[PDB]
Amino acid sequence: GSLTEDGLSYKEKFVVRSYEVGSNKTATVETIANLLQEVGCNHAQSVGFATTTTMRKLHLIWVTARMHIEIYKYPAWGDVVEIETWCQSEGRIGTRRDWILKDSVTGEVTGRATSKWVMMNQDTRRLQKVSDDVRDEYLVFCPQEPRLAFPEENNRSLKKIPKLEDPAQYSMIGLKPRRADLDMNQHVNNVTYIGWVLESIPQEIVDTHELQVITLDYRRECQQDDVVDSLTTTTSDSQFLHLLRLSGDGQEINRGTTLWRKK
Amino acid sequence: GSLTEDGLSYKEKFVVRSYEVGSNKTATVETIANLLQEVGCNHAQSVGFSATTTTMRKLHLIWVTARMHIEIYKYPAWGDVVEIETWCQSEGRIGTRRDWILKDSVTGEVTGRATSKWVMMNQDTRRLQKVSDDVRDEYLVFCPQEPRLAFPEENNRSLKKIPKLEDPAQYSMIGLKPRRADLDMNQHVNNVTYIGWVLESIPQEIVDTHELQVITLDYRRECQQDDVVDSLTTTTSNDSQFLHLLRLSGDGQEINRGTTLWRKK
Ligand SMILES: O=C(Nc1ccccc1)Nc1cccnc1
Ligand SMILES: O=C(Nc1ccccc1)Nc1cccnc1
């Protein structure tokens, strides 16, 4: 990987692996999400970072509040996928990380993603506004003019998500993370939540349709010893409403929507 | 990746990813196992497989793992480049063996090694069988003729019998189920997922104070995507050794058995 000529974005090529593909011999949305997370970490490494000289002195961390991914063509096993990522301040609210996925051979855009990040004290777990020091050190690595992966005014990534009303049409109960689901800080990987949302989608849908759009809100983090229940109801192409909650008290951890197109 | 000058082995370099590392900022044994499986697939692709031969496809025969043995000396850190070399070898009518050598791309030193035993099986009836002459000749043109062993030692750890864990287990992890990310392109549970399930019942205090050095895993039965697994562990022993057992949550049907050797950090 490498930063572009202007230093305001980062590019990396990936060869799709045999264990990264699904039943259609193409990469899964979780493999795609892992790659967006990989190019995001390599972009932060190349510019001297989530950890900053001001966030580290205050014990502040960036936490995902929302993820939106739109895939037009999933790369096949052995294909090369080029990803371009960049950051942007959004005033005091937080930061946004956007991605463009391209087919390395044709140059065609095959996907796009956007994510919203909020500040939080790592010890207290309390949300915060972005102060003037972290904002100043971020604007040196970000384009000053707005650069949006989803430019459309009032697009799908900015739409509110309702709460699934019981009873759910479909469900997957007793979902638990294992060590491969944790990251280097022993926290559940944000990609694992995507897979848990999708566990309650019927296999008949997965076999006849392809995932086109997914929007995921992150409300609470699941601890390594927590148990999750994934719920799904058809709202309609096929559209679904999703809800992740703790198996016991019913505490909400995530909510989302998925759009699927017939193969 | 590319086949070596002689065409009897395959080499591929891998940059270790941020999501592939554990609490020690180094690659997990499951990430390592996924990479051995990746270079194994790219070796089969480069020599003309789809990893079945023409005779195997005509008879509905597939290769199934019977045993996996991995020994790691140094786990590659996040961002490091790891070079892996793999090769196959016939073992008469018993089956085939795939061996690997892991090296640090910068220094050239060997940081790990692995060996695996594969048996022939009819994909439809699930019945195991001996390797026929025609199959043996088809892959011998891609294998070294002189023996080349990743674990050369006459009495080595990869050829030792594994006993069955006697109840009650010292530690346990119950209700382990595969999700879609645990299945492969044929909708079968990925053989690496079994390694993670074995390790789920190892205490977290062992994982935090020790490092996994050796793991031997026998594969007895395949877990279906709708099956539920129970992982069991008992300490058999500075180093720590464990006995492992994977079985179906209900009837107790055995799917895997193994051993792990851990050394103090
Ligand atoms: O992109 C990230 N997470 C993610 C991506 C896709 C889906 C779910 C989660 N993480 C990240 C970390 C450090 C810097 N930039 C990004
Ligand atoms: O070696 C393989 N699997 C594996 C590796 C390490 C641990 C567990 C499983 N797969 C494979 C498939 C086709 C050709 N060569 C190798």
Going from the N-terminus, what domains does chain B have, and what CATH number goes with each?
A: 2-159 (3.10.129.10), 171-264 (3.10.129.10)
3-state secondary structure of B146: coil
Searching chain A, which residue's CA lies closest to the CA of residue B191? A19
In sequence order, what are the beta bridge partners of A15?
A: A80
b (16+ CB within 10 A) / e for A64-85:
bbbbbbbbebbbebebebbbbb
CA of A88 to the centre of ligand 1 (A): 14
Which tokens belong to B219?
């594969």
b (16+ CB within 10 A) / e for A29-49:
bbbbbbbbbbbbbbbbeebeb
Cα A142 to Cα A110: distance, rounded to the nearest angstrom: 24
Cα B199 to Cα B261: distance, rounded to the nearest angstrom: 12
Cα A152 to Cα A172: distance, rounded to the nearest angstrom: 35
Cα A26 to Cα A28: distance, rounded to the nearest angstrom: 7
Q: Which ligand is nearest to the CA of A116?
A: 1
Cis (ω within 30 of 0) for the bond into B168? yes
Residue B41 bears catalytic tag: no
Cα B178 to Cα B115: distance, rounded to the nearest angstrom: 25
| Residue from B190, B223, B244, B256 carrying the catalytic annotation | B223
Q: Touching check for B200 and chain A: CB below 8 Å?
A: yes
Indicate the residue of B25, B41, B181 with minimum beta-carbon distance to A28.
B181
Q: Which ligand is nearest to the CA of B116?
A: 2
Q: Which ligand is nearest to the CA of B30?
A: 2
Q: Touching check for A225 and chain B: CB below 8 Å?
A: no
Cα A143 to Cα A87: distance, rounded to the nearest angstrom: 8
Cα B229 to Cα B223: distance, rounded to the nearest angstrom: 8
Q: Touching check for A195 and chain B: CB below 8 Å?
A: yes
Searching chain B, which residue's CA lies closest to the CA of residue A196? B179
b (16+ CB within 10 A) / e for B228-255:
ebbbbbbeeeeebebbbbbbbeeeeeeb
HSE-up of residue B189 (Cα within 13 Å, Cβ side): 23
Residues of chain B with C-beta less than 8 angstroms from the C-beta of A17: 34, 38
Q: Touching check for A21 and chain B: CB below 8 Å?
A: yes
Residues of chain A with C-beta less than 8 angstroms from the C-beta of B181: 28, 30, 195
Residues of chain B with C-beta less than 8 angstroms from the C-beta of A199: 179-180
| Residue from B186, B191, B210, B256 carrying the catalytic annotation | B186
Cα A121 to Cα A60: distance, rounded to the nearest angstrom: 5
Q: Touching check for B22 and chain A: CB below 8 Å?
A: yes
Cα B218 to Cα A199: distance, rounded to the nearest angstrom: 29
Q: Touching check for A140 and chain B: CB below 8 Å?
A: no
CA of B27 to the centre of ligand 1 (A): 19
For residue B183, count other CB atoms closer than 10 A to its CB: 17
Tell me whether residues B180 and A191 touch, CB distance under 8 A.
Answer: no
Q: DSSP of chain A, one letter per residue?
A: -EE-TTSSSEEEEEEPPGGGB-TTSBB-HHHHHHHHHHHHHHHHHHTT----TTHHHHTEEEEEEEEEEEESSPPBTT-EEEEEEEEEEETTTEEEEEEEEEETTT--EEEEEEEEEEEEETTT--EE---TTHHHHHTTSS-SS---SS-STT-GGGS--PPPPSSPSEEEEEE---GGGB-TTSSBPHHHHHHHHHTTS-HHHHHHEEEEEEEEEE-SPPPTT--EEEEEEE---EEEEEEEEETTT--EEEEEEEEEEE-
Q: Tell me how far the alpha carbon of residue A217 is from its chain's centroid.
A: 9
CA distance B44 to chain A (A): 12
Q: Which residue has the tokens 């392809």?
A: A210
Task: Report the Cα–Cα distance between both ends of chain A, in Å, rounded.
Answer: 33
Cα B144 to Cα B89: distance, rounded to the nearest angstrom: 7
Residue B223 bears catalytic tag: yes
Q: From atom 7 of ligand 1, which residue's Cα is the shortest distance away?
A: A33
Strand runs labelled E in B54-147? 61-72, 81-90, 96-104, 110-122, 128-129
Cα B66 to Cα B131: distance, rounded to the nearest angstrom: 14
Q: Could you tell me if residue A250 is left (phi over 0), alpha (psi between -120 and 50 degrees) or otherwise beta?
A: left
Indicate the residue of B180, B200, B207 with minimum beta-carbon distance to A178.
B200
Cα B201 to Cα B186: distance, rounded to the nearest angstrom: 28
Which tokens belong to A258?
């998925």
3-state secondary structure of B259: strand
Which residue type is seen at A254? N
Cα A260 to Cα B12: distance, rounded to the nearest angstrom: 36
Tell me whether residues A189 and B19 touch, CB distance under 8 A.
Answer: yes
Cα A185 to Cα B123: distance, rounded to the nearest angstrom: 42
Q: Which residues of A are catalytic?
A: 185, 187, 222
Q: Are B177 and B239 in contact (CB under 8 A)?
A: no
